[PDB]
């Protein structure tokens with residue numbers, strides 16, 4: 001019975017928490033010296049790409065309301081909190097010569113300090129998609145190898161300013177999503193590929209993302225880790241991939257190829273220093289090569305890996321060039337009119353709790369990761385502006401979703417997966433990228449009509465009751 005899952009089913013030192021990213025919650029987009037990110041620009045110049053034409057100028061105003069969020073996190077009672085630093089908040093021009101923003105540094109110090117004063121461990125992501133527009137404009141951001149050294153300078157600033165208090169770092173969050181939705185489908189910032197080339201740019205972007213991650217890891221391990229004694233890893237997008245027909249060799253290979261193109265793309269480089277065999281074969285000359293020094297730097301470049309999980313799909317074989325077609329699979333939601341899971345508030349999120357278990361087991365089996373966190377797992381409310389607060393806060397479906405997924409994490413730990421922590425996504429309803437504000441992922445409700453007033457959902461209350469202390 002999943003409804004009974006609690007902290008006493010986990011080791012005493014198992015880490016529970018919640019999450020956010022800077023662009024999605026902070027606001028103060030031009031306050032306290034922040035420079036623009038590619039997401040400010042995308043939402044400003046291309047509001048048609050956003051459901052409701054909205055943007056993160058104000059988001060849910062966590063920049064000004066940080067003390068209120070810390071009070072929420074204290075009452076919630078979980079050990080940890082995962083957030084990202086906005087690169088163009090601390091470095092408005094992305095590179096050092098664009099200026100060092102002291103006030104932006106003070107904001108993160110205030111947040112870290114409030115978190116530690118309340119017994120909450122900060123888990124901090126350097127890059128959650130908000131590339132400085134200055135670097136995007138000067139040289140194409142992640143399209144250019146120039147991004148590697150600038151990300152390193154930025155990482156080093158953060159390690160220096162915060163590393164005495166921050167002990168868990170992640171270089172990147174979902175570089176998969178960043179690369180694919182930014183450069184293959186062109187639906188997320190910087191909006192390319194839909195002037196862009198979905199057949200070449202996602203592979204260059206991912207290549208530079210990997211090299212940025214490698215160089216920041218090397219920087220931390222060689223220059224900060226002995227003095228600061230923290231850990232550094234990375235968070236990856238995952239989706240469970242199931243063969244459509246369990247007895248079809250062709251579907252078994254296709255589901256594995258889908259895993260290769262989503263997770264393997266990033267996991268194999270940090271495991272053996274090269275891309276998956278299947279990507280080499282299907283992408284060919286369009287997949288960049290790592291130099292021997294790059295391979296050596298990438299291999300084993302983490303102290304832990306976080307996985308982000310939402311949903312699952314059946315997979316079968318497919319029937320000029322583009323990342324989406326290179327995978328050579330067709331996704332399927334149903335077997336004989338039975339969907340793999342029911343929909344959440346979003347039609348792409350089919351609830352399949354076993355998938356987080358299979359994705360954990362798969363990651364240990366294939367990549368032999370010694371330390372794994374679930375860095376994101378969560379579900380969105382059905383869209384409804386007709387509900388009063390007593391009704392909107394009864395998130396039965398999210399409560400069941402978390403219970404079921406956390407139960408599956410425990411199952412994966414019984415299978416031998418060394419999971420060290422689990423972070424629900426998200427702490428607050430927030431800006432859901434291309435979907436804007438209508439998609440609510442929070443365990444804490446936001447009232448968009450009244451200065452983003454916070455109110456806990458039943459899921460938050462159950463997390464506190466079941467997992468506090």
Ligand SMILES: OC[C@@H]1[C@@H](O)[C@H](O)[C@@H](O)[C@@H]1NCC1CCCCC1
Pocket residue numbers: 021024173174177237308310376425432441
């Ligand atoms: O959309 C849910 C969260 C975001 O709010 C967060 O910024 C990000 O890390 C994660 N991506 C979901 C993931 C991305 C594309 C395929 C669907 C599922």
